[PDB]
Amino acid sequence: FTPVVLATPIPEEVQQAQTEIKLFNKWSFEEVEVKDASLVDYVQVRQPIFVAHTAGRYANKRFRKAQCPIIERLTNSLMMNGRNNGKKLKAVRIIKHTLDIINVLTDQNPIQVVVDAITNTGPREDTTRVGGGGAARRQAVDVSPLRRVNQAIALLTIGAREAAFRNIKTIAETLAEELINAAKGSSTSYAIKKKDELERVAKSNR
Amino acid sequence: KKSMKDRAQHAVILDQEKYDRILKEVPTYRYVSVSVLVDRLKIGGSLARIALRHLEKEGIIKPISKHSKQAIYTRAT
Amino acid sequence: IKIRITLTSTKVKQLENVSSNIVKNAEQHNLVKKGPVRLPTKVLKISTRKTPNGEGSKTWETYEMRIHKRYIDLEAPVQIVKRITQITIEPGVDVEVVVA
Amino acid sequence: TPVTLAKVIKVLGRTGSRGGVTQVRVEFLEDTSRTIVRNVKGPVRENDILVLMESEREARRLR
Amino acid sequence: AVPSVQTFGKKKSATAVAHVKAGKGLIKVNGSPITLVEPEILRFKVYEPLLLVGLDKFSNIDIRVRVTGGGHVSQVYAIRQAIAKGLVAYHQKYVDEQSKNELKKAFTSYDRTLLIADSRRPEPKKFGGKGARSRFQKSYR
Amino acid sequence: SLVVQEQGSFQHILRLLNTNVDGNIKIVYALTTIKGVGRRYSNLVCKKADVDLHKRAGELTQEELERIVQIMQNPTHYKIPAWFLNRQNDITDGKDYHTLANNVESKLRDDLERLKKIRAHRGIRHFWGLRVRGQHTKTTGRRRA
Amino acid sequence: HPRRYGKGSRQCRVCSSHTGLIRKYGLNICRQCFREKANDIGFNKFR
Amino acid sequence: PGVSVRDVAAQDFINAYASFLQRQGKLEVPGYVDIVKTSSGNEMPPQDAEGWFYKRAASVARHIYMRKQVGVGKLNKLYGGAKSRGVRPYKHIDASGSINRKVLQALEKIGIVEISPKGGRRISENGQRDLDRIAAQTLEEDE
RNA sequence: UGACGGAGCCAGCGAGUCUAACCUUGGCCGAGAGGUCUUGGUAAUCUUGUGAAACUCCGUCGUGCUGGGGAUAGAGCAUUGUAAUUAUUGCUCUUCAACGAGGAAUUCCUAGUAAGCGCAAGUCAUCAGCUUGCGUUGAUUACGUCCCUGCCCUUUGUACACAC
RNA sequence: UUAAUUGCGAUAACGAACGAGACCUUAACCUACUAAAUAGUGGUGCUAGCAUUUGCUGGUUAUCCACUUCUUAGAGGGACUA
């Protein structure tokens, strides 16, 4: 690595990250292999990005959403609850500060932690609706891994919304503490509590 | 039930009887930030920023990365 | 003598016939000039309700004027103010002759 | 948590009165060349990988 | 003469004309250099075209981009396409092919909008509704 | 980076202008508690008295509060351009006055009592308790009586 | 006759009606005669 | 190699220039100091009551060298903002004319800019050498 | 994912005076609305780069029917007009209530879409909380079904035919 | 099979028509043609500054020169599911 100088000097940090392999500011996109063999081909890896902002043509066809990175799936999941619509630069500021918090505590790669959290908190089976006539009944069958990850990101998103709502605690660390709790397993956060609630609901109506 | 709240008492003006313990109780903390100071040290968010700046003046902690209404910190290790 | 010819017409196929023609007449002799500028089309927006009374759905229509204007600039002495003023005018085409 | 790995090759069609459930043919990685019919919620197609909580069941159709 | 080429970019309402010439290797927009276009997050997003092959390609090349119109994120999305297209134009005007084909395939195989303009334009609003694909409340009995 | 000692001079309860004043909060916003003074006028008096803005109401000496509240009775003598006063160009006197926390309701009672004796359109409905500003009350404001 | 007006006393040019006027566009007429006139204003009707 | 304001960040430049006028040079005294809202859409005077003026001068001087020919009427809409007009939705409200006029008249005798024909004001050489030299020193203050 | 105040502060559609008085630039005065003297334009040229807002950066605040909210009223400052009182409307100060995510039921929606936000125009001498057009930021969720609400074709039944 | 009596095919039917389709406009691309101080771009002149050491930021219609890529539609090309 040799620093290259031009008519307008630039900080050496970006040049260092641009020398061998492109990454985030200090974070690396490698060593994030998924432990679950059922979630492959659905999470996007090995194609690093700098900022979660991207205007991709992912909503045109059926499965163009498969190549959507995990990180902005959280930011896109945060893009609701009314007045929070828009200003996606806030939606990318929250995640960057969230992974920054996970950097100091549990010094492993935060993006590998949220991937592990997605695998852990992803529900595997769920119940359906059956007419019956007069009364409604629920039948339980399996859930596709595409729906597994899509529901998994949402559970963290609306599990930290009310946790940081009407409280001094901000949403910067509320997402941070929720994802580590789901990853390691604590049975205290909203995501795990809802995951076992539907597991026992499906178990009862198996 | 919606009973009466606890009326949280985050500190807004420092004083010696409570200024002294920050240098002795904050240690042995792996992850530190502004938010943890508010809900655990019972101090204000603005008070946390100046106190951490004063505490980092002693060459123990460093901002590392910081921005508006957020910061990350880690004790001497 | 800075003779400027300005054209204003709605039918897009018509003033182009005029604009091409005056260029051809101005191409005679030498009569140095510039080509036809293309100014933005001033689309007019008139919006009215289809139903006269209040009965019916809230149906709306937008009637539009597409006026196209294209002027030319010519510079030459006094002969051209006589050899260009010959009017190649057609219904729907308006011409504005301004000198200097 | 006893789970089994499930491999899908063929798809039957979308079932259910609401249409949110799909009839999908699924095989097993362990003890392969065994056919068991199972249901699914999310969009599926050929060459996917699925995990089942239980392996001994058979549902023909759902409402 | 002077070796100079010019390109341009597009967005929803943002256009980014770029002036590229051989000099001391400077980058600036609206008189301000690359590290100040004020996205404060998408700063890396606009770094993207000029980092994934290094600074060896910008040793002695001045590029200047003028941006007008569009939203803030739309404005930021304009320079990256202008400099990438200007980078291609410089590769198409002064340097050889073996460097050119490697440069373009690195650009295309990573991101589309680096050189591909987005054709997803807003849909005109329809009568009887606030938005293009929105309708008023019916409220019948 | 200012460190201030908080000795026993701090008090949790305040009493100014014969009204209850709460402490433990910013003095600038603690003066808004006392009725008749709004957010805008609060900072004018706070900066006119040359007192610190970020100090709390509890940690406050007698001289500073006396200096703050002595403005209210006669602010015009204290070089104010005289457009913030709630009682300017009064009918009785014609001068600019600032009714304190206890004369606010006495003033409008006098204002209402002279509207009632005159039996104007704006006064009869005020005695009736209905709308006098022309606002529609046929379908709005049902659940107030 | 004693009269003041001068504050919007404009009627339809072709039917003399003080109903809704479009105006500020050179027509100062009513909506209905604007409809049943055709081929004069906004005739193109591409949209 | 020659540093202008465009080569440095906007926030640190107007802060360094504000501290320059805070410490050196007398800008002017507005008279209605920290008693105005600096606009019509706002209802609270600036928190930096002792300041808000020399940094006001730094911002307008930077922008009057950014732009070419603008007047106080333009300055009102430049620094306007949405006003919470009660129940009505937010609408843009222009800044106070007197505040922008006072700072402009404050800085005329300083020399930061001179009166231009055809409307607006054009930057003088005396008022732009210092406006440009400050940028040549503000980027080296970090180290 | 907030309120407030200071910095960065980017668009598009359209309109605009002749025998009349429209859009208004610049200078000056006033906290503000607003007032005076001129300048440019019958219009891509001048209003207007409509420098708009939502937006981000610096600070204060703090979980408190409180700095959210301005309904409710009082007084004062101006504009429109022959006249404005049941405040036309704008501006300034003060009073600071209900409302703390709304129960049956119901409305719109498959991409720049919904939603958030603003701009131009229609009503206008003045007055947008409406509508018509335009622009900024801009999600998750479907790629299926007729189960409810409706539609089309074929078969069957009808004591209907102004027709369930 | 298609959004479509939209097509194949079958067939006491053949020949047909209207609607849909077809057609037009708008939003899309054109560094391909005419191009254009009522839109601009670069340079040559005058002038202002920063380090002066090579550059950068500007302003200027009678200071001109070259061009239409960015701004404007004219004739046009361009995806028909190849």
CSV table of C-alpha atoms in Angstrom, one decimal, chain A residues 13-93:
chain,number,residue,atom,x,y,z
A,13,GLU,CA,-8.5,6.3,5.9
A,14,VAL,CA,-10.6,6.1,2.8
A,15,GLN,CA,-7.5,5.3,0.6
A,16,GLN,CA,-6.5,2.5,3.0
A,17,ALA,CA,-10.0,1.0,2.8
A,18,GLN,CA,-9.9,1.5,-1.0
A,19,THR,CA,-6.5,-0.2,-1.4
A,20,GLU,CA,-7.1,-3.9,-1.2
A,21,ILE,CA,-10.8,-4.6,-0.6
A,22,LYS,CA,-13.6,-2.1,-0.3
A,23,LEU,CA,-15.4,-2.1,3.1
A,24,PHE,CA,-17.1,0.3,5.5
A,25,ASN,CA,-15.1,3.0,7.5
A,26,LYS,CA,-13.5,0.5,9.9
A,27,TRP,CA,-15.8,-2.5,9.6
A,28,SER,CA,-15.2,-5.6,7.4
A,29,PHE,CA,-17.8,-7.6,5.4
A,30,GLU,CA,-15.9,-10.8,5.7
A,31,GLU,CA,-16.3,-13.6,8.4
A,32,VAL,CA,-20.1,-13.3,8.4
A,33,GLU,CA,-20.8,-16.9,7.2
A,34,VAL,CA,-24.3,-17.9,8.3
A,35,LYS,CA,-24.6,-20.7,10.8
A,36,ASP,CA,-28.0,-21.8,9.6
A,37,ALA,CA,-27.9,-23.7,6.3
A,38,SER,CA,-31.5,-22.9,5.6
A,39,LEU,CA,-31.0,-19.1,5.2
A,40,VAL,CA,-28.4,-19.3,2.3
A,41,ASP,CA,-29.2,-17.9,-1.1
A,42,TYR,CA,-31.6,-15.4,0.6
A,43,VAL,CA,-29.2,-13.2,2.5
A,44,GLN,CA,-26.8,-11.1,0.4
A,45,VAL,CA,-23.1,-11.4,1.3
A,46,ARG,CA,-19.7,-11.3,-0.5
A,47,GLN,CA,-20.8,-8.0,-2.1
A,48,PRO,CA,-19.8,-5.2,0.3
A,49,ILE,CA,-21.5,-1.8,0.3
A,50,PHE,CA,-20.5,1.5,1.9
A,51,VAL,CA,-23.9,3.1,2.8
A,52,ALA,CA,-27.3,1.4,3.1
A,53,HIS,CA,-28.8,4.0,0.8
A,54,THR,CA,-29.6,2.5,-2.7
A,55,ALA,CA,-32.4,3.0,-5.2
A,56,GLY,CA,-32.4,-0.5,-6.5
A,57,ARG,CA,-35.1,-2.0,-8.8
A,58,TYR,CA,-36.0,-4.6,-6.1
A,59,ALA,CA,-39.8,-4.2,-6.1
A,60,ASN,CA,-40.4,-4.8,-9.8
A,61,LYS,CA,-40.4,-8.6,-10.1
A,62,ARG,CA,-41.0,-11.4,-7.6
A,63,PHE,CA,-37.6,-12.3,-6.2
A,64,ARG,CA,-35.5,-9.3,-6.9
A,65,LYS,CA,-35.5,-8.7,-3.1
A,66,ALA,CA,-33.3,-11.7,-2.5
A,67,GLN,CA,-30.1,-9.7,-3.3
A,68,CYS,CA,-31.1,-7.0,-0.9
A,69,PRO,CA,-28.4,-6.6,1.8
A,70,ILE,CA,-29.4,-7.2,5.5
A,71,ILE,CA,-28.3,-3.8,6.8
A,72,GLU,CA,-30.8,-1.6,4.9
A,73,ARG,CA,-33.5,-4.2,5.5
A,74,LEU,CA,-33.3,-2.9,9.1
A,75,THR,CA,-33.4,0.7,7.8
A,76,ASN,CA,-36.3,-0.1,5.5
A,77,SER,CA,-38.1,-1.8,8.3
A,78,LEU,CA,-37.7,1.3,10.4
A,79,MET,CA,-39.4,3.3,7.6
A,80,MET,CA,-42.9,3.3,9.1
A,81,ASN,CA,-45.0,4.5,12.1
A,82,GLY,CA,-46.3,7.6,10.3
A,83,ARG,CA,-44.1,10.7,10.9
A,84,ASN,CA,-41.0,8.6,10.6
A,85,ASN,CA,-41.6,8.1,6.8
A,86,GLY,CA,-38.9,9.7,4.7
A,87,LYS,CA,-35.5,11.1,5.6
A,88,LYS,CA,-33.7,7.8,4.9
A,89,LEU,CA,-30.5,9.5,5.8
A,90,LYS,CA,-31.8,9.2,9.4
A,91,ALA,CA,-32.5,5.5,8.6
A,92,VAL,CA,-28.9,5.1,7.7
A,93,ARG,CA,-27.6,7.1,10.6
